[PDB]
Amino acid sequence: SLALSQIEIQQFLSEAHAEFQSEGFLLQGAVRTKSGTKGSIVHFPVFG
Amino acid sequence: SLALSQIEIQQFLSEAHAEFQSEGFLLQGAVRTKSGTKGSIVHFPVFG
């Protein structure tokens, strides 16, 4: 019977799509970097 | 005599030419494809 269209189902996919966005870390290593630092402030001495 | 034209033969070729047409599936793999889906509507979740 064509009445089967009354009990048609819908499928929801488990693979989600994240909206196109930047993943970041684009400027990693572009500047003088100090890793594993401790303390509230890191001081860079400068001479004229 | 020229009556030999009444018993002339003809040649029929076995290789058939299909009219110039697209074979389709040109955009196969151009978009995100999910195979073996079910239902009348398929839903793709999206995150922000």
Q: How far apart are CA A19 and CA A16, in angstroms?
A: 10
**Contact indicator for A8, B37 with CB cutoff of 8 Å:** no
Q: Which residues of B touch A20 (CB under 8 A)?
A: none
Going by C-alpha positions, the residue among B17, B42, B10, B48 that lies closest to residue A14 is B42
Stated resolution in angstroms: 2.1
Total length of chain A: 48
Residue of A5, A13, A19 with shortest CB distance to B44: A13
Q: Which residues of A touch B40 (CB under 8 A)?
A: 5, 8-10
Collapsing DSSP states into helix, strand and coil, what is residue B47?
Answer: strand
For the record, the structure tokens of B38 come out as 């079910």
**Contact indicator for B42, A10 with CB cutoff of 8 Å:** yes
**Contact indicator for A9, B40 with CB cutoff of 8 Å:** yes
* Burial annotation A28-48 (CB, 10 A radius, 16+ → b, else e): eeeeeeeeeeeeeeeeeeeee
